[PDB]
Design a protein around this ligand. Sequence first.
Ligand SMILES: O=c1[nH]c2cc(C(F)(F)F)c(N3CCOCC3)cc2n(CP(=O)(O)O)c1=O
Ligand SMILES: O=c1[nH]c2cc(C(F)(F)F)c(N3CCOCC3)cc2n(CP(=O)(O)O)c1=O
Lengths: 33, 181, 261, 71, 48, 49
Amino acid sequence: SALSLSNVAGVFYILVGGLGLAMLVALIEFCYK
Amino acid sequence: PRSLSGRIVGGVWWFFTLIIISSYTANLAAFLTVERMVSPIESAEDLSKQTEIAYGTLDSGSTKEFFRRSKIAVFDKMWTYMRSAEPSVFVRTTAEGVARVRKSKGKYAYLLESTMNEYIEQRKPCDTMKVGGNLDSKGYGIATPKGSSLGTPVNLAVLKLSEQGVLDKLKNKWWYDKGEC
Amino acid sequence: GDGKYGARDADTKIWNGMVGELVYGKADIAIAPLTITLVREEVIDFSKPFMSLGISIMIKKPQKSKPGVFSFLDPLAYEIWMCIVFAYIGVSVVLFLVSTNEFGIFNSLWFSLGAFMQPRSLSGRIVGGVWWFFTLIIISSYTANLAAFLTVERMVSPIESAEDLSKQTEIAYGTLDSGSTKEFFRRSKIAVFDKMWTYMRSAEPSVFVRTTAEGVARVRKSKGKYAYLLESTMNEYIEQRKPCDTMKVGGNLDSKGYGIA
Amino acid sequence: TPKGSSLGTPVNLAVLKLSEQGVLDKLKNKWWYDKGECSALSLSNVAGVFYILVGGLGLAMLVALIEFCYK
Amino acid sequence: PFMSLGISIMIKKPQKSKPGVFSFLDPLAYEIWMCIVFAYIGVSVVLF
Amino acid sequence: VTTILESPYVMMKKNHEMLEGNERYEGYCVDLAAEIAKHCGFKYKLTIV
Ligand SMILES: O=c1[nH]c2cc(C(F)(F)F)c(N3CCOCC3)cc2n(CP(=O)(O)O)c1=O
Ligand SMILES: O=c1[nH]c2cc(C(F)(F)F)c(N3CCOCC3)cc2n(CP(=O)(O)O)c1=O
């Protein structure tokens, strides 16, 4: 009976999703230049 | 500056760490609140699946002869250990066995009659405890000479006491109620 | 023939079942789970117990951890995740009015970078401070609230001894309607089992099941909110059948015995 | 009991016999308590910190509107 | 019989004491530390 | 024995339609009634006022 990785996991996916989102908005930045 | 690209990466990673360090801050407060305990020793099958915690029985007695004669899967592994265990996992008396657990910091388990086990658990200083179900199926009884006139009387009277709940009441009296734990 | 163990109808004064088929001359011996009760030892003879038993507690198999992502959206309620975003864009819009159509997009991209939390214009100065005081209370409350869930989750002790059943009431419990099991509690005078009977006697709805089978399904269809009490022999056997969703806990309640009659 | 009844004295005594024997106490416990029937959060608390926030937004929006007039 | 019994196991109860630099790795699980380092380098590789 | 219908002193038991006489009711004063009749020794029938 320790700490559940379940709850914490859901916040890992909004992160890597946000990383990919700004791996996307990053790629469009360099384009207009 | 306000580079809208990695601006949200800085923003989203911040939310990611806020939650995590809060989830740690929370669950740690619970660890310092309850501070529950666990005992490694569950069953007798838990004694034969490890070696770090030694164990033994009496050198001479029914408890010793049991494992020596037992031909059950789990119990077999226990006796093969005890017979050639170094140093001698066999103690001299019951008191020496309890003292060998009380002075091992939990590295020495002792196997005895479940009757005095529960009694030891209720004598000072409340350090030991029985764990798991008993290993066999025995029983104490009233002994009367063969062909006695007290034979059928006492036997029937025993059953009358148990169903009434006298025995259950009596054991609660000299073990737990007048126990010291 | 009748399919009963052994009883003595007080009216007709006639035994029935296996025990009966010994007395009236039909059978020579009885090899079965026959309880050595005093009422029988007077009329028939029993061998020594070939299996020491007693009454136990059949609880639901403690299902393994845990629910999913939905435990993250629970401490901070869904409604509060909303207002913190409305106010979020409600702050960055206030800051936006402190600083031609493209000049308000980079500043809004700068007021959103100052919003993605972590000169002396007294206007926007007291907006950043109040916001910090705002986000402070929320994350303090989140840590405090989530701590409670995880504090109790450590506190929820597994029901072990029978005395545990008596101390609480969140998990209801009962026995069979008729049989030696139920008759124990009603008659027992031990402190623990006393209160157990008192509760079960007045319990609504019925904590008593008709058949023994209705008990097992009632523990499997309560997800742990119900416990069934019965003989140890029948209990242990149940745990070794599909879907492996029940288990025996704690020691027995009494010291019975099966014997050859 | 009706005045000067036969049951007069014995009942009075018998009642008191039931007091110190604790059965009157036990009877009450039977029908009052024995037979009787008797991990989440909220928004109500959090709301009080939300209005001071928007209030801090409406005050600085006022300080924003007074700082452009001076300059 | 007037009291059923058998052979039992006696052990010593562990105290509250359990020092060592391990009960800090226990809350935030080992797997999470990995991904909090995997998504970590996953961030520094995004910004880079 | 005269008595008033009042909870939880004297209440109509659930299946009262099937019972007759005294078993019809139950409560505090109901159980008290018999206990009064025990240490005085008399038969009695409860009637509602
Ligand atoms: O009839 C017998 N009854 C016994 C009863 C008890 C007790 F539990 F105390 F009641 C004990 N113990 C004494 C101290 O160590 C723990 C158990 C030993 C018994 N023995 C010897 P064994 O069975 O040959 O080992 C018998 O023979
Ligand atoms: O001698 C007796 N031996 C019994 C043995 C068992 C079993 F465990 F299966 F071996 C059972 N169960 C059957 C299903 O319900 C649960 C227990 C009932 C028995 N009864 C009736 P009871 O004791 O009056 O309840 C006896 O009389």
